[PDB]
Amino acid sequence: EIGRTTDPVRMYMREMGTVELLTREGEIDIAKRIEDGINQVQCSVAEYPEAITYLLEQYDRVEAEEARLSDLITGFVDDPELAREKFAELRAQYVVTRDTIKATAQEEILKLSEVFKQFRLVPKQFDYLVNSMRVMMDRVRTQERLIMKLCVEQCKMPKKNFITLFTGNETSDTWFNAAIAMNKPWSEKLHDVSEEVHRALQKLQQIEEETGLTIEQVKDINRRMSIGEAKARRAKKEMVEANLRLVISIAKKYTNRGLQFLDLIQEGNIGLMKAVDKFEYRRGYKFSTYATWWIRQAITRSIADQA
Amino acid sequence: EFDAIKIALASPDMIRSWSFGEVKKPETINYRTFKPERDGLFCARIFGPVKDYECLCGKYKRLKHRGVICEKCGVEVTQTKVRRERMGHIELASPTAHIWFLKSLPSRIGLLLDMPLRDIERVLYFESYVVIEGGMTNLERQQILTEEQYLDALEEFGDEFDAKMGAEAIQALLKSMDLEQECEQLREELNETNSETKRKKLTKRIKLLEAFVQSGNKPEWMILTVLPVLPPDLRPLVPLDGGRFATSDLNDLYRRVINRNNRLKRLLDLAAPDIIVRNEKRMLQEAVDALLDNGRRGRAITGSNKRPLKSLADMIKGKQGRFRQNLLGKRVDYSGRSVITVGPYLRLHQCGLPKKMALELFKPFIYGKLELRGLATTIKAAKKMVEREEAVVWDILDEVIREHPVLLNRAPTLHRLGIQAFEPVLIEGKAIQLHPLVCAAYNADFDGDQMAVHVPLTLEAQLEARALMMSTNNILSPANGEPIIVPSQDVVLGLYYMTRDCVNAKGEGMVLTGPKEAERLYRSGLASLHARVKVRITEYEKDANGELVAKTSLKDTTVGRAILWMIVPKGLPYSIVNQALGKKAISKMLNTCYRILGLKPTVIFADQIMYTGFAYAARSGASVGIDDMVIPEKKHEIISEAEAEVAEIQEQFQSGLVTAGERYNKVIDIWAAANDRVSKAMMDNLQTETVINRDGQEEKQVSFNSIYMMADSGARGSAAQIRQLAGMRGLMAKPDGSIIETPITANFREGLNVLQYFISTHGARKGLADTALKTANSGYLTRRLVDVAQDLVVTEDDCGTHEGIMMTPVIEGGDVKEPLRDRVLGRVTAEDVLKPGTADILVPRNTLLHEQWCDLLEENSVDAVKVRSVVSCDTDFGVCAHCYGRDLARGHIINKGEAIGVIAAQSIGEPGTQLTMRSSIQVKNKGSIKLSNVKSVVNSSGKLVITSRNTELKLIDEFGRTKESYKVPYGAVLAKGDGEQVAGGETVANWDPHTMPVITEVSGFVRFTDMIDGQTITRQTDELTGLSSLVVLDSAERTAGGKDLRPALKIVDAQGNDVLIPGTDMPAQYFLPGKAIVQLEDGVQISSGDTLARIPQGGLPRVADLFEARRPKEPAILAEISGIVSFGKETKGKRRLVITPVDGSDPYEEMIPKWRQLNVFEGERVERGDVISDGPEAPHDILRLRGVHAVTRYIVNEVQDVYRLQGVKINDKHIEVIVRQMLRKATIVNAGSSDFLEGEQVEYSRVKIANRELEANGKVGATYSRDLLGITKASLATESFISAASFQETTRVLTEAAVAGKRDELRGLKENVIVGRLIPAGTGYAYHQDRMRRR
RNA sequence: AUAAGGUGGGGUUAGUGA
Ligand SMILES: [Mg+2]
Ligand SMILES: [Zn+2]
Ligand SMILES: [Zn+2]
User: Fold this and answer.
1) Which of B43, B92, B510, B1325 is the most buried (most CB within 10 A)?
2) How far apart are CA B518 and CA B526, in angstroms?
3) Rounded to an integer, what distance in angstroms lies between the CA atom of residue B824 and that of residue B828?
4) Which domain does A145 fall in, by range?
5) Range of the domain at B1333
6) Protein B1031 CA to nucleic acid C7 C1', in Å?
7) Could you count the other beta carbons within 10 Å of the beta carbon of residue B14?
8) Which residue is nearest to the C1' sugar atom of C16, using CA?
9) How many CA atoms lie within 13 A of A105 on its CB side?
10) Where residue B643 sits, what CATH number does that domain have?
11) For residue A255, what is the domain's CATH number?
């Protein structure tokens, strides 16, 4: 009795009619969750040492003017001179944390993350760090597939013996000499690929040496970051799902300018996505008024160059 | 260069191989400047040089740089022609179904999967999920899922179990299909299902599978991924007048589709929720099919004017897609067009032509010879010479149109005389002058018809023109051997005025020695023209070896007969001109002139009679006057008594002594009778009104009234039209289609009233409206069946066979309405003519029957000749000439090559306009009585009654031929018997149409068996007599309690024994059907032939439905096979039959709609193909039961009755031959050592050579069964897909053949014109003897 | 040879006497 409704608009109304309208305080609730998402991934950003290395190096690109004054920072909370006291002082915090690495080392990692947590950056640096830990998980993941591939798919190692003792450390020979010390016939086959697994594991030990952390800790950093990121995206999808009635309501205006209707609704969907990307709730306004501008931007932009 | 056309479905990387780039940006031009852009639609570096050997930026401006690309934009220098064909691709993001395979109806995707199309549409438009690779669930690998039950699956098997949506899922599921398990498995299930539904659906399934793997395709290519883009110059961007631009649709929707694509890409980049990208993918789906076939999706789209834009699909289909628009009919150079006029001074091998149109049409010839004479060296000099009009060029195009033929065309070019050739004579003025005898062949009156001309340029085509197109060639119709160069209308008036005679005139009855003296007497004005004088004339004849002998006498004749005797050439009898020479007499005069004296004397004779025709017609002075139309004085009185009679029947209705319809019918009859009285009243007043002295007192003769000459000679009009002038006109019909009771009493010489005129304009408007829509249908009929024939070429000499059909003179049931000698004329016999001298061979078995032979067996009164037909020609892919016969425009045998299928098609097609719109047996003449299929018995009265409906009453004459044919009813009281002699005008029969008799054949008792009052029969006394009778009811009125009881009247003797059927040992029970009234009660001893019970009771699209071969409204049911019968089970949607063949088994029984009053009885044993009831005789069973010759003879009798009703001639070979194109297909009954499926259709020629060379092997071939098909779908069932592609439903045949991977060696015509080479019919048949001879 | 030229709509012309 779904009457072959070949209008895509009709069924599109049938999906967008599921979610009801949210009040403006629910926007405080959801944008609160958004600030949780970006704030927690800023915590995981703060828990990365090579971000601080590359940070001070990019600050040397700023004062060397191998970068720009607005290509590293986007203001702060609570003018390169502020960046001289902030990143020279942060250089001193970095060396005084870096000296004590040989317990309270990790306490100074925490306080270095706290003096860094005030800091706000140009989002390309955020791209650098997301791709930095991302490629880091690609190399870690590569060693996971490598030692899993050779021990499991070569030495007939049970994956129960693999995940229980191996996963988490991944750089020691405790699974190696202890699993071979289990006297199993798969364990006696673990002598076959000790070269590729252990010598290719030497670069993974080098990874832990570069980051100054175990693989497990880094996995907590970027994995927990991934939790906050996915959470934030759930919030943003949820808000968009609220505001579809707004976008068709404004979409009624500019219809017959030589373009089809659903093109307008999709362009406006893009515009409200960008408006979600650029809204703040501590401003204290209703979301729609700020959103309107991005929607007209998308529409008039689109029909403008698509004449 | 190249052989056959091959198609296949498109691989993706094939499309990548076709392109030279990817389009990425939705713009096309600058609009600011006017440049083409980087990678937009109109691209240079993808598509090539928009300029000519030059770059976009103009980097490589000379022809020297040819070969290297540019660098400022990177374009290769070539011609600008190369941007017409370089294709491009686009890479779409998410896959997309091709809707032709989705919605061809039947869907290839649909029955390929065997899931209903509704579910596929639910998957496509994202409102449903569906699961690939089900496996370890409680749920299948091909089950649709709704999203809350996908929420359910998301709960339970929300594990590794997979299910997707849309064209990705369709590509995946359709990709993961194994094909061979489907093949073997579905062959097995074909071996299982007894239901013919499942056998049918599963065999279509197995056809598409086993054909799909056999072609080298892949299934998963059917989901479109990489879209080819059209080359830009074929989707051009023109400007209109000013800065605006007339767009194309195609450029618009290409803009839409790549806008769609790129937005989907950036949306995939941004990680949007599934609602949005879901919606966008649906938008891409409608985008892509909106490119392919707009409108087949539920709502179309428009750009402007709210008017749906044109996709690619309608760019092929329809009245202006490329097939009928720009491929069969092209616009041609070297042509002119203007208005025709006469100029009778021409001879017929030439036409007039204006000087301006000549000087335009032959300009390159003027350039050529003008260069030759050196009057101007260079070309542009000749340009200004032919512009400025110097006097020398009139000598030049005067010279070059000396013997260069041209063509003429009139726009409604129905049959092939619409194109004829002439030799131009230059005319001062600017209209086209035209010889008069061509006009009737063109059907081109001079009311303002325009004609167009053409020029064959090349040398060989000039030879084709003068050889074949030249107007002196065609004088006989291709439809029949009648001349079409008959004089039309006024020359026959002049000649009719010439050979006539008033009874006393100047020079009445003197003598004269020779026609020159008669000419001197006329132009000297000393004797009258219409005055009889005994003269001397002299003539010739060729009785010997073509040898012309002088002989002479003193004939008595007129003056003018002796005058036009001088024009007649040598070999004629005199008495061809010794009469009044109506249009018919001069027509057969020219005909016999062609038969006896060949070609040229007929030609020059025809021109000369045209000249003297207009001479003496003009000198005659034939006027018209108002005083010429004569009112009969009795008209007033006949109308007066008529209105008295309608006053009498009207007063019978005033007091109501008569009913309405009776007064209606008597009044309309007496108006018919009085109307006829006025008709022969004015005829008897006109035709012989001239009463004059003759050297004596008085004498009557024919009238010199102008009207009576114009109608009598056959010029224009008839007795009907002059009946509408002088006498009253008609009884006009009413808008209902019935007829008005008051006739139009007035006539056109007097004044009509208001309302008579009002009624008349009703009739006229209805008339010409019917002409409009009738034209519309007739063109579509010819358009159809020219396609179904299209291909039959006379390609061999002699098949060497002995089959064929049997020609007889046809008799309607009254007079012979078409004799023998015309159905036989010019068709070579099958066997030899045994003379009816008993064992004498008259004519041998393989002879042409020209006129002498036809006179020969005409004398010996031969009744039937088996003849060779084209339905029996054993030729593969053609017809031998000895099965076809004559040309009918060239009086000899047919030659080798003439594609006679199309002349058959035009031949039946051109009468399509002139088609019309709005007891006992009494013999007439005397002969012997003959009956056939007689099952008779002498009754008690000495009369004859026949218990076979299939008996026919015939009248053999005193020679032996049949002259009457009559139906003999079941049990009709004949006054005479078989083999007897009657007199002409005698009733010889009797029956009742208001009684189906249940008569007997023997003597004895009749017992009331199973006549139970209330269950089978009923007690219905006769309220008029008193003799009560037990009336037998039918099944639907009697109750079911004795419905299974069959009341019978079984013949017993005085002992009660079974009085058997005479001849056999079965009882003679008379089972009693509905409305059978058993009058003769119980214990009544009966006589022979007495009723034991009594049971009482088209135009053109007829013809189109005959070649359509439709199942009619209810078919007459027939007997599949010989044997006895019984009846079947009571009311099961219908009451059944049970048929029991005698020798073999009895597999056959059938439910029967018992509205069919049965004809056969239970004890009757019949033959196959015989009637069980009557009604329209469906053709398929005539094929499948009575055979090949029967169904053809049925068809040609039927439509020959249709045209012959209108008196429109067509010789019978054309209907024969297009029927041979109808029944070309066949099916398989057993394989034997064949390789075909049993359930497989194939053309009869290909299976005939299949078993025919399996006969060369020791193995047995195959057993077949032929079919006939409607021509509109027989043409679709053709191996050449381009031929059907030019016909209707291009999409269906295109997809079906497209997935077939079918190949086409072209072996035919409209595809050889579609590819532009020699046609393999005429001269190109010799060329294809060559190209066939090489490979 | 610089008059060229798509798409709709409208109007008109030519197409029997039994
Ligand atoms: Mg005309
Ligand atoms: Zn360039
Ligand atoms: Zn033959």
Assistant:
1) B43
2) 10
3) 9
4) 6-65+79-306
5) 1271-1335
6) 76
7) 13
8) B914
9) 9
10) 1.10.132.30
11) 1.10.601.10
